[PDB]
C-alpha cells in the first residue's frame, strides 16, 4: 500500500458508482435550480493535498505551523471574492471559511445576536429558506428558530410578490434585530432599498442571502444587494458554478465605525467551526476568477433568457406560475390547479430523466407532499442550451406531466401511483419511449468537469 | 470556455500554490497530531461530479429528484462505517452527513438537549476540545457554551490523568444531561467504564468524541468506546486518513425489556440525531466528501491498516522515549496513543516561540495548551503526533532522528530567547541575525534531505 493507487484500481465498487452518477448527469435534463456543473479546474483543487492541512485561525494568525502557503490561498480567495463583486476592500471584508450556506447564515446570527434575539425572514412556503428562521405551526424545524426567535413575512397572495407594506407593519411591532432578504424559490427581484427603509426604521441589520442569485449579481445582470445590505451571505455552488462552500461579506470602515468584522470572524472560528476546508477554499477561488470574465456575463445573460423562455413556454401551455413569470434563473410551477401534486410530478419526470424537485407554493402546509415544482436554467445553460432548447425541455415536461395525470386518474394513494409507473406495461412503455427521446436530446450537449467522473 | 480545461492551464496562479503546498508536505517533518496524508483514491472521489448534486434528506426520502446513485453511495458509506468499527447494524446506526467534527458534536447536542441544558467536558487546557463546552473566565468561546450550559472536568495535576473521582463529585451537584468523553491533547486512554458509571448515577448520556483515536479504534489496537458509549462522534481526516468530514454513531434497537409486559423498550436516538443534522442544522449534504469517506473506510478494514495503526503506537512511544531521554517533560509522563504533549515551561521556552523556530526548519507542529495554561495564543506546550509520518513509512528509528532535529531547533530557540525579549523581537531575530539564519538554514537542509527520501500518499503533483 502506497496511497497512490488510483480509485478505479483500489475501489472498483466506488469507481462504478462515480461513473454512474456522471452518466446520469450527462443524459438528463437537470433542472434543479440550486444545481450547476462545476468546472474541472475547480474540481482539481477540491480533490488535492489541501485536504491534509489544519490551519485554524486567519492568515498570519494561525493556531498551527506550516500555514504559509494556505495563508496565500485564503488571502487570494478573499481578494478574488471582492473583485468578483466589484467591492472596495476598504468598505467590505469577506470570510471564506464557512463550510456551506447554512453554516454561513448561522454564523452571522451567532456573531450579531444573543440567544433568543429576534429575526425576520420570508416564510418558507412563500419562498424563504430554512435557515431564515423557519418553524411551522407544529414544530421548530430550523435550528435558527430554536436558538433565535423568528417571525416570518409573507407574499401578497393575489400578486405573488413580497408584501413590503405588511413587512413594515409587522416589523414595527415585532422589533427584529435582523431582517433577512433572500429566497430559495422566489422568481422576482427583491426591493433591497425598501428593505433598507424598514431596517432603518426599526434599527435592524439587513442581511442579504444571495445564494441563488450570486452568479447573476457577479455578472451585473441584476441589481446588487451590496448597495443596501449590512451583511451578505452566499453559497458558491449555485449560479456561481463553484465547489460547495459558503461566504460571508460584511461592511467595514466608517458608517458615520462598523464593528462587524471581529464578531463575524470570531463566530466562524473558534465559536462555530473547526479546521477550515482549504481544498474547498481553493476550489472557490478558482470559480471566482472565472466569474470575473466576460464569458461569465454572457453565460449569466443566457441564464436569464433561458428561464424567461422556459416560463413563456409553460404559460402558453396553461401552467400556473407563482408571481406569473420570472425575472431570474428559476420558475415555480403551481401544479395544484392542474390536479397533480409536486411529489407525483417529480417522480414521473425523474423516471424519464427530467430532474427537478417538488417545492412548496404559497399556502402549502407539507414540504414532503407540496403542490409545486421548481425549475431552474443554470445547469443546462452551462451545457450551452439556448432558448429554443428550453422550449424543447418544456415540450418533454408537458409530456411527462400528462403521463402523470393519466396514472393519477387510475390510482388512489401515492404508493399506488409509484407502483403503477413501474408495473403497468402500457405506462412503462410510454415512459421508456419518452426517456429515450430525452436522453438522446441531452447527451448531445457538452458537459463541464472530468470526462468520466 | 468548456469547463473541461485543466487547472494548470486555466489558473496557473492557483496551480502554482497547489504545488508549493504539495512540496511543503513532502519536504517537511509533519508532526501535527490531527493531520494525515489522504490517499489518492479518496482524493479522486473528493474532486468529483458528486459536488454538483443536491440530495437533502436521507436515502429513499429525498427532497430532490435524481438521487438514485447518491442514495447508493450514502448507504454504502453507512455500511462501511459500521463494518470498519465492527458494529452490529441492529444495535448501531450512523449518520454520515456532518460537514466536519465540530458540526457533528453540535448536531448531537441539538438533537438531545434543549437550549441551556447542561453538559460536562474536559477543560480545554486540560486536553478537551473547543466543542466540549469551552468557555474561559472572561468570555464564552465555543458556541457549545453559548447555546448550552457547560461545566468542565479536570485533570489530576499531580498525575496528569483525568480525575474521575472529582468528576463524579461535581456531576452529582451539576446534574449534566450529557457528559463528553474525548480529547484533543491527552496522551492516555480514557476509562470509559468509569465514565459510564458516573453517567448512570446522574442519568446522563455518554458521548464519546473519538476523533483523534478513531483510526486506532478501527484497527482494534486500543480499547473501543463503543462498549460503553451511547453516542460516538468522530472526524474522518485524522487517524482514519480520509477526507475532511464527520460521522455520528448512535445506539438503536432494544435498550431494556419491560418486566411486566415482557416487551422491548427501544432506543430513541435515531430520529432525533437525523433530524438535528437535517433539516435543523445543515443544508445540502456534501456528496463528494461522503464518497471520499467511504473510500477511506474501506481502506480501514484491511490488514494493512492494522499494521499501520500498530506502527503509529510504536512510533509515538519511541518518540516519547527519546524526548524523555533528552530531558523533556511530557504531560502525564508518556503516551499510550498517537501523540505526545511536551511541557516546555520547565525548559523556559513557550509554545509559540518553539513552533516558529521548528517551522523555519521544516518541522511542522503546533503550539498547545498545557494544564494550568491561561492563553492558547501563547501556551506553554508543543503537541507532536505520529500518524502523518507513519503514513510515509517512518519507523521507530526514524522518529528517534526526528527528536534529534527537534532538540537542535529547540536549543537554537533557547539561545535566541536569551538574546531577545518580546515575541516580535525573538521572531525578527530569526531572520535578521546572519549567524542564526545560517544555523537554521543548515538544520533545514538536513531535515528536508531526510524527509524527502520517504514516499508520500496522494497525487504526485497536487
Ligand atoms: N422555499 C424553499 N424551497 C425549498 C427549500 C427551502 O429552503 N425553501 N429547500 C431547501 O434547500 C428544499 C426543500 N427542503 C425542505 C426540507 C424540509 C422542510 C420541512 O419543513 N420539513 C419538516 C416538515 C415535513 C412535512 O411534513 O412535509 C420536517 O422535516 O419535519 C422544508 C423544506 C427545496 N425547496
Ligand atoms: N486541548 C486542545 N488543544 C488544541 C485544540 C483544542 O480544542 N483543545 N485545538 C482545536 O482544534 C487547537 C487550538 N485551537 C484553539 C483555538 C482557540 C482557543 C481559544 O481559547 N481562543 C480564545 C483565547 C485566545 C487567547 O487569548 O489565548 C480566543 O480566540 O478568544 C483555544 C484553542 C489545537 N490544540
Ligand atoms: C437562499 C439560500 N440560502 C442558504 C442555502 C443553504 O445552502 P447549503 O445547502 O447549506 O449549502 C440555500 C440552499 N438552497 C437549496 C435549494 O434551494 O435547493 C438557499 O437557497
Ligand atoms: C476531539 C475532537 N473533536 C472535534 C474536533 C473538530 O473537528 P473539525 O476541526 O471540526 O473537523 C477536533 C479537532 N481537533 C483539531 C486538533 O486537535 O488539532 C477534535 O480533536
The residue assigned the cell 445543515 is B282
Cell numbers given for A126: 412563500
Whether the CB-CB separation of A121 and A92 falls below 8 Å is answered with no
Query: Number of helices (H) and strands (E), helices first, in chain B?
Result: 16, 19
At which residue does the C-alpha cell 479546474 appear?
A41
Q: How far apart are CA A168 and CA A195, in angstroms?
A: 9
The residue annotated as part of the active site, out of A209, A312, A334, A389, is: A209
d(CA B125, CA B152): 11
Nearest to A335 by CA among A350, A317, A352: A317
Q: Which residues of B belong to the active site?
A: 54, 56, 209, 235, 238, 244
Instruction: Please provide the distance, in angstroms rounded to a whole number, between the alpha carbons at the two ends of chain A.
Output: 24
**Assigned domain for B107 exists:** yes
Task: Collect contacts of A214-217 with beta carbons under 8 A, ≥24 apart.
Answer: A214/A238, A214/A239, A214/A240, A215/A239, A215/A240, A215/A241, A215/A291, A215/A296, A215/A300, A215/A303, A215/A378, A216/A300, A216/A303, A216/A304, A216/A328, A216/A329, A217/A85
Report the nearest-CA residue for atom 7 of ligand 1: A129
- Resolution of the determined structure in angstroms stands at 2.1
Distance CA A82, CA A252 (A): 13
Taking residue A229's Cβ as centre, other Cβ atoms within 10 Å add up to 24
8 Å CB contact between A35 and A240: no
Report chain B's terminal Cα–Cα distance, integer Å. Answer: 23
Query: In chain A, what are the helix, strand and coil shares in percent, each to the nearest 5?
Result: 50, 15, 40
Phi, psi values for residue B235, rounded to 5°:
-95, 170
**Residue A10 is assigned to a structural domain of this protein:** no
Phi and psi at B96, nearest 5°, equal -110, 10
A275 lines ligand 4 (CB under 6 A): yes
- The residue from A291, A319, A337 where one domain ends is A291
Using the mean position of ligand 3's atoms as its centre, give its distance from the Cα of residue A101 in Å. Answer: 6
Rounded Cα distance between B443 and B435, Å, is: 12
Q: Is A54 tagged catalytic?
A: yes
| Domain-embedded: residue B308 | yes
Widest distance between CA atoms in chain A: 72
Atom of ligand 1 nearest to the CA of A186: 1
Contact B295 A453 (CB under 8 A): no
Q: Are B291 and A14 spatial neighbours (Cβ–Cβ below 8 Å)?
A: yes
**Distance, CA of B355 to CA of B349 (rounded, Å):** 10
Same-domain pairing of B377 and B280: no
Distance from C-alpha of A209 to C-alpha of A101, rounded to nearest angstrom:
9
In a domain, B103, yes or no: yes
Site residues for ligand 1, CB cut-off 6 Å: A 124, 127, 129-130, 141, 184-185, 357, 359-360, 366-368; B 56, 63, 279, 283
CA A109 to CA A129: how far, in whole Å? 15
Please judge whether A347 and B65 are an interchain contact, meaning their C-beta atoms are less than 8 angstroms apart.
yes
Residues 6+ apart with CB under 8 A from B171: B120, B153, B179, B198, B201, B202, B204
Find the B332 Cα to ligand 1 centroid distance in Å: 50
CA distance B248 to B266: 19
Burial label for A158, CB within 10 Å (0-12, 13-18, 19+), is exposed
Q: Which pairing describes strands B29-30 and B363-364: parallel, antiparallel, or unpaired?
A: parallel
- Let me know whether A211 and A243 are in one domain: yes
Three cell numbers at A54?
489544519
Q: Is residue A39 part of a domain?
A: no
| Chain mean position to CA B44 | 23
Q: d(Cα A431, Cα A425) in Å, to the nearest integer?
A: 10
B178, containing H or E segment: strand B178-181
> CA B56, B61, B64, B65 torsion: positive or negative?
positive
- C-alpha of residue B279 to centroid of ligand 3, in Å: 11
B144 and B244 fall within a common domain: yes
Tell me the three cell numbers of residue A360.
412548496
Calpha distance A100→A234 (Å, rounded): 9
Q: Could you tell me if A212 and A33 are in contact, meaning their C-beta atoms sit under 8 angstroms apart?
A: yes
3-class DSSP assignment, residue A119: strand
Domain count of the fold of chain A:
2
Q: Which of B1, B14, B391 sits opposite A45 (nearest CB)?
A: B14
Q: Which residue, judged by its Cα, is nearest atom 20 of ligand 4?
A: B184
The DSSP H or E segment spanning A357 is strand A357-359
Helices (H), B51-191: 68-84, 101-112, 164-174
**Which ligand gives the minimal distance to the CA of A346?**
1
Experimental approach was X-ray
User: What CATH number is given to the structural domain containing B213?
Assistant: 3.40.640.10
> Are residues A93 and A103 in contact, defined by beta-carbon separation less than 8 angstroms?
no
Render the burial of B50-64: b for 16+ CB within 10 Å, e for the rest.
bbbbbbbbbeeebbb
Identify the domain containing residue B332 by its residue range: 303-451
Q: Which of B339, B205, B202, B161 is nearest to B153 (CA)?
A: B161
Q: How far apart are CA A143 and CA A152, in angstroms?
A: 15
Cα dihedral across residues A108, A109, A110, A113: positive or negative? positive
Cα B367 off chain centre by? 15
Alpha-helix residue ranges (DSSP H) falling in A129-174:
164-174
Report how far apart, in Å, the C-alpha atoms of A220 and of each of A25, A226, A299, A311, B436 are. Answer: 29, 12, 12, 22, 53
Judge contact between B77 and B295, C-beta under 8 A. Answer: no
Q: Is residue A12 part of a domain?
A: no
Ordered DSSP codes for A290-325: HHTSHHHHHHHHHHHHHHHHHHHHHHHTT-EEGGGS
**Of the candidates A372, A273, A283, which has an alpha carbon nearest to the alpha carbon of residue A321?**
A372
Q: Count Cα atoms within 13 angstroms, Cβ side, for A374.
A: 28
Residue B180 three-state SS: strand
Ligand 4 centroid to residue A402 C-alpha, Å: 52
In a domain, A16, yes or no: no
- Among the candidates B254, B273, B300, a domain finishes at B300
In terms of Cα–Cα distance, which of A337, A363, A298, A314 is closest to A156?
A363
What are the C-alpha distances in Å from A181 to residues A82, A167, B246?
A: 20, 11, 31
The CATH number covering residue A429 comes to: 3.90.1150.10
Same domain, B225 and B348: no
Answer for the pair A32, A239: CB distance below 8 angstroms, yes or no. Answer: no
A56 has catalytic annotation? yes
Do B122 and B139 share a domain, yes or no? yes
For residue B391, which residues of chain A lie inside 8 Å, CB to CB?
3
Ligand 3 and B284: CB distance under 6 A: yes
Task: Give the list of residues 6+ apart from residue B106 with CB closer than 8 angstroms, or none.
Answer: A272, B131, B143, B144, B281
| Strand positions, DSSP E, A53-184 | 57-58, 61-62, 92-95, 118-122, 149-153, 178-181
Same structural domain, B215 and B186: yes
Q: Which-ligand-closest: CA of A277? A: 4
Domain boundary at A256, A291, A326, which? A291
Assess whether B237 and B355 both reside in one domain: no
Closest CA to B250 of B92, B373, B138: B92
Q: Is residue A35 part of a domain?
A: no
Cite the beta strand spans of A144-253 per DSSP E.
149-153, 178-181, 205-209, 231-235, 246-251
Measured in degrees and rounded to the nearest 5, phi and psi for residue A26 equal -75, -35
Please answer whether residues B269 and B252 qualify as being in contact, where contact means their C-beta atoms are separated by less than 8 angstroms: yes
Regarding whether B308 and B276 lie in a shared domain, the answer is: no
Q: Looking up cell 464519546, which residue turns up? A: B208
Chosen for mutation from B48, B61, B276, B304 (greatest number of chain A CBs closer than 10 Å) is: B48
Closest CA to B319 of B217, B251, B213, B398: B398
Cβ contact, residue pair B366, A52, below 8 Å: no
- CA distances (Å), B45 to each of A54, A439, B461, in order? 20, 25, 17
- Judgement on whether residues B265 and B342 belong to the same structural domain of the protein: no
Say yes or no for a CB contact (<8 Å) between B284 and A100: yes
Regarding whether A298 and A253 lie in a shared domain, the answer is no
Cis peptide, bond prior to residue A270, ω within 30 of zero? yes
- Phi and psi torsions of B257, nearest 5°: -120, 125
A260 & A313 share domain = no
Question: What grid cell was written down for B155?
Answer: 485533570
Instruction: Report cis status (omega within 30 of 0) of the bond before B279.
Output: yes
Rounded to whole angstroms, how far apart are CA atoms B236 and B48?
A: 18
Measured on CA atoms in the order A367, A372, A376, A379, is the torsion positive or negative?
positive
Dihedral Cα B369, B371, B373, B377, nearest 10 deg: 10
CA of A207 to the centre of ligand 4 (A): 30
C-alpha cell at A269: 472560528
| CB spacing of A34 vs B54 below 8 angstroms | yes
Claim to verify: residue A362 and residue A350 sit in the same structural domain: yes
How near does any CA of chain A get to the CA of B258, in Å?
Answer: 31
User: Which residues on A lie below 8 Å from B2 (Cβ)?
Assistant: 446, 448
Amino acid at each position: 500500500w502506497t496511497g497512490q493507487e488510483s480509485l478505479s484500481d483500489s475501489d472498483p465498487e466506488m469507481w462504478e458508482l462515480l461513473q454512474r452518477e456522471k452518466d446520469r448527469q450527462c443524459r438528463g435534463l437537470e433542472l434543479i435550480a440550486s444545481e450547476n456543473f462545476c468546472s474541472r479546474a475547480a474540481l482539481e483543487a477540491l480533490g488535492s493535498c489541501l485536504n491534509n492541512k489544519y490551519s485554524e485561525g486567519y492568515p498570519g494568525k494561525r493556531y498551527y505551523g506550516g500555514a504559509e502557503v494556505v495563508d496565500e490561498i485564503e488571502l487570494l480567495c478573499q481578494r478574488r471574492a471582492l473583485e468578483a463583486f466589484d467591492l472596495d476592500p476598504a468598505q467590505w471584508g469577506v470570510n471564506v471559511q464557512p463550510y456551506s450556506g447554512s453554516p454561513a447564515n448561522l454564523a452571522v446570527y451567532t456573531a450579531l445576536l444573543q440567544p433568543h434575539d429576534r429575526i425576520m425572514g420570508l416564510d418558507l412556503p412563500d419562498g424563504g429558506h430554512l435557515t431564515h428562521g423557519y418553524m411551522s405551526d407544529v414544530k421548530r424545524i430550523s435550528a435558527t428558530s430554536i436558538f433565535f426567535e423568528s417571525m416570518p413575512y409573507k407574499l401578497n397572495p393575489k400578486t405573488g410578490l413580497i408584501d413590503y407594506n405588511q413587512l413594515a407593519l409587522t416589523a414595527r411591532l415585532f422589533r427584529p434585530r435582523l431582517i433577512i432578504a433572500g429566497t430559495s424559490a422566489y422568481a422576482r427581484l427583491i426591493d433591497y432599498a425598501r428593505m433598507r427603509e424598514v431596517c432603518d426604521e426599526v434599527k435592524a441589520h439587513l442581511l442579504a442571502d444571495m445564494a441563488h442569485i450570486s452568479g447573476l449579481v457577479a455578472a451585473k445582470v441584476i441589481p446588487s444587494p451590496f448597495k443596501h445590505a449590512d451583511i451578505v451571505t452566499t453559497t458558491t455552488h449555485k449560479t456561481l458554478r463553484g465547489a460547495r462552500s459558503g461566504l460571508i461579506f460584511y461592511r467595514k470602515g466608517v458608517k458615520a465605525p462598523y464593528t462587524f468584522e471581529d464578531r463575524i470572524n470570531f463566530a466562524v472560528f473558534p465559536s462555530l467551526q473547526g479546521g477550515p476546508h482549504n481544498h474547498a477554499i481553493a476550489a472557490v477561488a478558482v470559480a471566482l476568477k472565472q466569474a470575473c470574465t466576460p464569458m461569465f456575463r454572457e453565460y449569466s445573460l443566457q441564464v436569464l433568457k433561458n428561464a424567461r423562455a422556459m416560463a413563456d413556454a409553460l404559460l402558453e401551455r396553461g401552467y400556473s406560475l407563482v408571481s406569473g413569470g420570472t425575472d431570474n434563473h428559476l420558475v415555480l410551477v403551481d401544479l395544484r390547479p392542474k390536479g397533480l401534486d409536486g411529489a407525483r410530478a417529480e417522480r414521473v419526470l425523474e423516471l424519464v430523466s427530467i430532474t427537478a424537485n417538488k417545492n412548496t407554493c404559497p399556502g402549502d402546509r407539507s414540504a414532503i407532499t407540496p403542490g409545486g415544482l421548481r425549475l431552474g436554467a443554470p445547469a443546462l445553460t452551462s451545457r450551452q442550451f439556448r432558448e429554443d432548447d428550453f422550449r424543447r425541455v418544456v415540450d418533454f415536461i408537458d409530456e411527462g406531466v400528462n403521463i402523470g395525470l393519466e396514472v393519477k386518474s387510475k390510482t388512489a394513494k401515492l404508493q399506488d401511483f409509484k407502483s403503477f409507473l413501474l408495473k403497468d406495461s402500457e405506462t412503462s412503455q410510454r415512459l421508456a419511449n419518452l426517456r429515450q427521446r430525452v436522453e438522446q436530446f441531452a447527451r448531445a450537449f457538452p458537459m463541464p468537469g472530468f470526462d468520466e467522473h
